[PDB]
Every structure is written in structure tokens, then in C-alpha cells.
Amino acid sequence: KVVNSRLRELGEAPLEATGRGRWALCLVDGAPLRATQSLTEQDVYDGDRL
Amino acid sequence: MKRGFARPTPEKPPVIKPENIVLSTPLSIPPPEGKPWWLIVVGVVVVGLL
Q: In Å, how far is A47's CA from the nearest CA of chain B?
């Protein structure tokens, strides 16, 4: 929501897709992150990209 | 959140070696020694006239 809100301030269209599925965070190779664990448990630190 | 980092003992940098060098003194121009050119010129005339 905040990303979509910020995109409109940038004048860019919000994130949208069609078909059965869901929205989630992924790595540069496309692998999705764990949905039930803390970012402190995963190997995420300041300055990472997702 | 950040990854911890402890600084170890610094590794040896490459040592600089100064040098003292004395330049070679230039060559000296040979003073103008001189042949009695006219004497041999008269000579070859005299023997020829004989």
C-alpha cells in the first residue's frame, strides 16, 4: 500500500497483476522469503535489496 | 541492524627504499692542437720540382 502510494507521488502506476496467486517479497533470483519468520532470523540487514 | 566487525592487527605495507645517486661529470673538449700544414705543402713542391 505505501509502495503504491509512493509510486503515485512519483507519478508511476501502482503494482498490479492478474491470475491466481499472491504478493510477496523475493530475492534477485526470484526465490521468495519466509512468511512466518522475523527479518532478524533471516539473513537480512541494513542496505539489502528485495 | 548491522553485522558486527572486529578490526585485526594491520598487515605489513610494502616498505619504501630511498637512494642517494651521484651523477657522472661531462667530458672535456680537446684543446686545439695544430699541424704545420704549410711546411709539408712546400715540401711536396720542392721534391716535385727537383
A: 9
